[PDB]
Amino acid sequence: VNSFSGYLKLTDNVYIKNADIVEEAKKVKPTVVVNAANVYLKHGGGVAGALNKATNNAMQVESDDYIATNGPLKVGGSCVLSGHNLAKHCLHVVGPNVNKGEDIQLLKSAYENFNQHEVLLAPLLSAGIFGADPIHSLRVCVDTVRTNVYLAVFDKNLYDKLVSSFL
């Protein structure tokens, strides 16, 4: 038993809710919240900009130190940093950005990072401003992640479409 509430169950291990991931994280304080990061951990907009804003920019300060020490992430890669006031940990995961021409096959590699964590609160990778089809992203998530994932979808219209088209 865990504290996630109001989710629709899609599969044995994947759940979905129309929710603002920032507000969901603030209430649940999950062990892991996933950020839709870029390789530079520049949290300007989308999910990343919203998560970072909710931390009063502490996520960005920590991220800049991480990059100064380690250099950029790989597309499809991840790093674990603090969850600040939102979660114990933040798993920063880089899905491919279609608006940068990155290979969509890397979306599966991105979701594989989730398997290193037993339970996660997450957005759909490569959705939103990353330009991928969220229905495809949901399919890859279901077919790749084996650990327990609670997907927060900000847009109600999109959430209803994801549920109604789910196979």
Ligand SMILES: O=C(O)[C@]1(F)CN(c2ncnc3[nH]c4cc(F)ccc4c23)CC12CCC2
């Ligand atoms: O940034 C993108 O492209 C996204 F569409 C944004 N998404 C979100 N998902 C779940 N809760 C969210 N709260 C927010 C508050 C905001 F001000 C802005 C975006 C969100 C948001 C998923 C996405 C990241 C991969 C695709």
